[PDB]
């Protein structure tokens, strides 16, 4: 069992800590390490969680930790430091020998910043003079949704008036009471909520960019929502009905001309299933209805996230693709972490050829906070240098707006990051370069 905090070893060691959120793993455990005289770094994917550790440690233990985020760093000179993974990377990683112990919290996290952060720690900690790296999570990879004592789970059949993701919902099952239906998209939420209204039911849609008050506090209601609800709203429900699908970023080696990165419908994993289910069964018995028995277990992520790491290396952290590969290699080689196809050589080769980006476009896409700032600005750079329009006039291609009256002809398409709305040419040298990266890799070709 990995349920107890590791003892500090005499020389270097990587260990796992599996413990629930709030249980002490991010707070009590580093406090106890510091009471022993060690300097402790705690990394977390969230700015909010990171600040919150500081508030807990101060008020509960009279410990004022250092707190480091992209906005600002607060330094007390104390032995414990909380940082986001992003700020840690921006600070140069293990500029040791600063810390004796590094706790990678929520180490199941599969956002690109966490992955690159954790790989950085694993590649650098020992050389930086650390004695211990703790990979801590409340949700170890390979986790599956487990039975809940207060929630009755009932599969959907094909019997029912309301068509729902290949199955049916009987109306009797949502007439009277308060029910929550998860749909994968805002459009499905609008379609279903309209349909239910027409059937005489009290239904209302909820998603990103609507007020929480549009959900009534009392009364029979059927709420039709996306995962936006969970951040979100607080009340619980008589039942949850889950479409068991979600929208996520995926790469497709679509060869038109190269690859496509976009949001795609995919099977839901154990974490999503557990979270959606958990909106019923609070304080009384709940009901969970599902389209499909799950799941993907947790802890698998898409090759597009590896791409995103190389992107971030080049955009934010002044890392060459070769440097990024070293860090990601340490991550992939460490057992017990999230897993993904080994596309390191491929993605490295691609970014290696993306030379002479325009600095001003890159600062614009960075400041704008859109995904893949490096690839978006590189496409924009290619567009401007060819006096050609962007793939579309989506907000993505914002930096080219001032130049719009002088951009014309087909887009020299490098790859696809969203919908295509202009004529394309595939003659650009970089396009050819990226196609060759694909052909030169047996895992991708």
Ligand X SMILES: Cn1cc(CC(=O)O)c2ccccc21
Of 72 and 284, which CB lies nearer to ligand X in the complex structure? Answer: 72
Judged by CB under 5 A, does residue 202 bind Na ion? yes
- Contact with ligand X (CB under 6 A): which of 26, 44, 66, 69? 69
DSSP code string of 382-414: HHHHTT---S--SGGGGGGTTTGGG--S-EE-S
Strand partners, 104: 43, 135
Quick note: the x/- pattern for ligand X over 348-367, rule CB under 6 A, is: --------------------
> Does residue 86 belong to the site contacting ligand X (CB under 6 A)?
yes
**23-42 residues near Cl ion, rule: CB under 5 A:** 24, 26-27
The residue from 87, 167, 184, 276 that contacts ligand X (CB under 6 A) is 87
Measured from the CB of residue 396, what is the shortest distance to ligand X in angstroms?
A: 17
Q: How far is the CB of 402 from ligand X (least distance, A)?
A: 26
27 binds, among Cl ion, Na ion, ligand X, none (CB under 5 to 8 A by kind): Cl ion
Report the alpha-carbon distance of residue 162 to residue 177 in Å, rounded. Answer: 17
Report d(CA 30, CA 230) in Å as an integer.
Answer: 30
Please tell me the distance from the alpha carbon of residue 248 to that of residue 226, in angstroms, as a whole number: 13
Which is nearer to Na ion, 203 or 430 (by Cβ)? 203
Which of ligand X, Na ion, Cl ion, none does 87 bind, CB closer than 5 to 8 A by kind?
ligand X
CB of 47 to ligand X, least distance (A): 5
Per-residue exposure over 84-117, b if at least 16 CB sit within 10 Å of its own CB, e if not:
bbbbbbbeebbebeebbbbbbbbbbbbbbbbbbb
Q: Which of residues 209-238 bind ligand X (CB under 6 A)?
A: none
For residue 8, the 8-state DSSP code is P
Query: Nearer to Cl ion by C-beta: 137 or 399?
Result: 137
Among 27, 44, 81, 84, binds ligand X (CB under 6 A): 84
Site residues (CB under 6 A) for ligand X, limited to 280-339: 316
Cα of 242 vs its chain's centroid, Å = 21
E strands of 101-238, at which residues? 101-104, 132-137, 151-155, 162-164, 167-169, 178-182, 203-206, 221-225
Are the C-beta atoms of residues 245 and 268 closer than 8 Å to each other? yes
Strand partners, 224: 181, 205
Q: Which does 202 bind (CB under 5 to 8 A by kind): Na ion, ligand X, Cl ion, none?
A: Na ion
DSSP-derived secondary structure letter, 337? S
Alpha carbons 73 and 341: distance in angstroms, whole number: 36
**Judged by CB under 5 A, how many residues of this single chain contact Na ion?**
1
Binding mask 113-132 for ligand X (x = CB under 6 A): x-------------------
Residue 47 binds to ligand X (criterion: CB under 6 A): yes
Site for ligand X in 88-107 (CB under 6 A): 90
Residue 278 neighbours by CB under 8 Å, 6+ apart: 148
Residues found near Na ion in the complex (CB under 5 A) = 202
Residues found near ligand X in the complex (CB under 6 A) = 47, 69-70, 84, 86-87, 90, 113, 316
């Amino acid at each position: 069992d990995n349920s107890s905090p590791p003892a500090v070893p005499q020389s270097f060691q990587v260990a796992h800590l599996h413990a629930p959120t709030g249980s002490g793993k991010s707070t009590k455990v580093p406090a106890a390490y510091a009471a022993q005289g060690y300097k402790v770094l705690v990394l977390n994917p969230s700015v909010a969680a990171t600040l919150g550790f500081g508030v807990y440690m101060s008020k509960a233990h009279g410990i004022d930790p250092n707190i480091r985020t992209g906005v600002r760093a607060i330094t007390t000179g104390g032995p414990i430091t909380y940082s986001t993974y992003g700020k840690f990377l921006a600070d140069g990683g293990c500029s040791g020998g600063a810390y004796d112990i590094i706790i990678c919290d929520e180490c199941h996290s599969t956002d690109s910043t966490s992955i690159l952060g954790i790989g950085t720690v694993l590649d650098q900690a020992e050389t930086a003079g650390a004695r211990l790296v703790v990979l801590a999570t409340a949700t170890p990879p390979g986790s599956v949704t487990v039975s809940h004592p207060n929630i009755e789970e009932v599969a959907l059949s094909n019997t029912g008036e309301i068509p729902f993701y290949g199955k049916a919902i009987p109306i009797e099952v949502i007439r009277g009471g308060r029910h929550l239906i998860f749909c994968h998209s805002k459009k499905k939420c609008d379609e279903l909520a309209a349909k239910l209204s027409a059937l005489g039911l009290n239904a209302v849609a909820y998603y990103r960019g609507l007020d929480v008050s549009v959900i009534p506090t009392s009364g029979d209601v059927v709420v039709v929502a996306t995962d936006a609800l969970m951040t979100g709203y607080t009340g619980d429900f008589d039942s949850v009905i889950d479409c068991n699908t979600c929208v996520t970023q995926t790469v497709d080696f679509s060869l038109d001309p190269t690859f496509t990165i976009d949001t795609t419908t995919v099977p839901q994993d154990a974490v999503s299933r557990s979270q959606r289910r958990g909106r019923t069964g609070r304080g009384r018995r709940g009901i969970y209805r599902f389209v499909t028995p799950g799941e993907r277990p947790s802890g698998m992520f898409d090759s597009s996230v590896l791409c995103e790491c190389y992107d971030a290396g080049c955009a934010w952290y002044e890392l060459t693709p070769a440097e990024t590969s070293v860090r990601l290699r340490a991550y992939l080689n460490t057992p017990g972490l999230p897993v993904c196809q080994d596309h390191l050589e491929f993605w490295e080769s691609v970014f290696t050829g993306l030379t002479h980006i325009d600095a001003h476009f890159l600062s614009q896409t960075k400041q704008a906070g859109d995904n893949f700032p490096y690839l978006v600005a590189y496409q924009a750079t290619v567009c401007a240098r060819a006096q050609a329009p962007p793939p579309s006039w989506d907000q993505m291609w914002k930096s080219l707006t001032r130049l719009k009256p002088t951009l014309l002809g087909p887009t020299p398409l490098l790859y696809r990051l969203g919908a295509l709305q202009n004529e394309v040419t595939l003659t650009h040298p970089i396009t050819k370069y990226i196609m060759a990266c694909m052909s030169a890799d047996l895992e991708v070709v």
